[PDB]
Ligand SMILES: CC(C)=CCC/C(C)=C\CC/C(C)=C\CC/C(C)=C\CC/C(C)=C\CC/C(C)=C\CC/C(C)=C\CC/C(C)=C\COP(=O)(O)OP(=O)(O)O
């Protein structure tokens with residue numbers, strides 16, 4: 381993955397270059413390694429020493445800049461998207477006078493040493509190209525045991541108030557914010573929360589989802605409660621329902637009108653995963669898996685190695701047999717009085733996790749992995 385650190389000043393600043401500065405404001409408490417690499421680059425290329433005015437975060441640095449409390453800040457590009465949450469116009473307020481590119485080696489997929497593996501499915505709340513940065517509102521762990529032919533779907537509510545890994549600095553915030561930092565943040569957050577290894581991920585957005593359902597010829601689910609979606613455009617009666625792509629996206633997004641709200645929305649997402657798996661495990665879809673890869677690779681990100689896809693597909697083509705699927709959801713209590721690490725100035729709704737639910741969820745993941 382590619383990112384950058386820059387020295388930024390106000391758009392109208394008389395400052396044109398780093399040699400005109402004596403200090404820069406930066407969150408060296410939390411991004412020190414990156415910040416020092418920028419400062420060494422500036423020393424190398426411009427023979428300019430800069431002292432650091434420590435800020436509590438990139439957001440705090442940005443606030444000090446616009447307030448005119450500092451002349452210049454360091455900005456790590458990843459955090460631009462975090463700043464944007466409180467300051468949507470931030471890009472228009474600043475100019476960049478020095479830029480350094482950075483590359484982080486992606487954490488490899490982990491091959492399980494047994495019959496079970498965990499795949500994290502992250503669903504990003506935007507239309508458009510897959511590289512579009514947004515929140516991760518779908519966060520479903522799929523625990524698969526090829527020996528017992530069981531799958532467990534664990535849904536963690538988007539609003540779940542948990543320590544956010546990496547860019548989140550392990551501070552508590554809504555899980556969905558982890559998606560802004562990147563898929564590695566979401567993965568590590570859930571690995572930390574459930575105490576399990578996540579072998580692979582799949583990341584997709586609204587546009588990705590539509591393309592996938594189109595390719596599979598829609599999906600078939602059993603709907604448990606009458607509801608409508610997307611400003612009353614779609615109406616879903618009780619019973620068996622065929623969902624084309626737009627219908628399916630409405631089906632997985634609606635929560636307010638459901639009897640159990642977001643928990644029911646979580647259950648509808650789980651129904652749709654099962655329905656997708658049923659399409660993906662048809663003889664034709666398996667035989668044609670390479671065409672599916674070709675058709676969706678520009679819109680769906682995954683680190684499942686090709687080799688592994690081939691093994692999973694071919695084992696299934698040879699053996700047949702359906703996976704029995706069970707589902708569970710992490711429970712808690714909605715609150716509006718807890719601080720968001722990403723958005724400290726805003727009152728947000730979060731779900732404080734129930735301890736006993738966490739224990740149950742963890743135990744069920746372990747059981748399925750071990751074949752209990
Ligand atoms: C068959 C094969 C390949 C192998 C053999 C099978 C085998 C042996 C194993 C199976 C495992 C493998 C390797 C492959 C199979 C493929 C898998 C595992 C899954 C496919 C399913 C998938 C990729 C996605 C389904 C995700 C889903 C239910 C929804 C995603 C929709 C999105 C992007 C967003 C919605 C966000 C929401 C709810 C609100 C935002 O909306 P908004 O922001 O407006 O609302 P607000 O925020 O305000 O609420």
Ligand SMILES: [Mn+2]
Nearest residue numbers: 505515517556
């Ligand atoms: Mn959303």
